[PDB]
Design a protein around this ligand. Structure first.
Ligand SMILES: [Cl-]
Ligand SMILES: [Cl-]
Length: 194
């Protein structure tokens, strides 16, 4: 098959988060867009594309209100386990000389381990996230509050089209099975808006 990095696993924690529908209060769980932003914050170069395949929602979904009434609903006390990998960016063949698997996998590993190359945000400039590396064994065994049930989380924003033409948004039916949410390719999203 085409080049694919090893699977990487990251744990993301935050006291507060705000995951929104930018093509319209927080969704109850991260969107693919939000997770993409988190993982890219750990390490990204246009040579490669980070591909988020699954997230585990570890803690009970809780929100809290902030604002005035004559309004902002944030998630509270969140923990996500993210499974992802990278592939070479087909849209940047001009960077083909930098497609060095050992180099990028080493940097990714180091980057997750140190908590990311950049500050990690969970939806606002005040919602900081904390990233650390977990093993596949840990990804598989850390208990989720939602283990035992499967829950329809409804239609959620997936991502914007990429990469002139009007901006298209993709949305997806979102099911959380024993705390785990898988992310389908943009091309499989049932709902598209321009
Ligand atoms: Cl390839
Ligand atoms: Cl869908």
């Amino acid at each position: 098959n085409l080049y694919r990095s090893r699977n990487f696993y990251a744990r993301i924690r935050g006291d507060r988060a705000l995951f929104t529908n930018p093509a319209t209060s927080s969704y109850s769980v991260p969107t693919r867009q939000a997770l993409q932003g988190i993982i890219d914050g750990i390490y990204h170069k246009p040579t490669f594309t980070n591909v988020i395949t699954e997230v585990k929602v570890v803690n009970q979904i809780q929100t809290e209100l902030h604002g005035v009434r004559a309004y902002v609903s944030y998630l509270s006390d969140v923990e996500y386990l993210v499974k992802f990998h990278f592939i070479w960016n087909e849209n940047r063949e001009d960077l083909i000389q930098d497609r060095l698997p050992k180099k990028h996998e080493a940097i990714m590993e180091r980057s997750i381990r140190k908590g990311g190359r950049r500050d990690i945000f969970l939806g606002t400039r005040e919602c900081f996230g904390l990233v650390d590396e977990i093993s596949q064994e840990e990804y598989e065994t850390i208990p989720s509050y939602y283990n035992g049930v499967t829950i329809d989380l409804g239609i959620m924003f997936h991502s914007f089209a990429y990469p002139d033409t009007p901006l298209k948004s993709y949305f997806t039916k979102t099911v959380m099975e024993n705390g785990a949410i898988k992310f389908k390719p943009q091309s499989e999203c049932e709902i598209v808006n321009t």
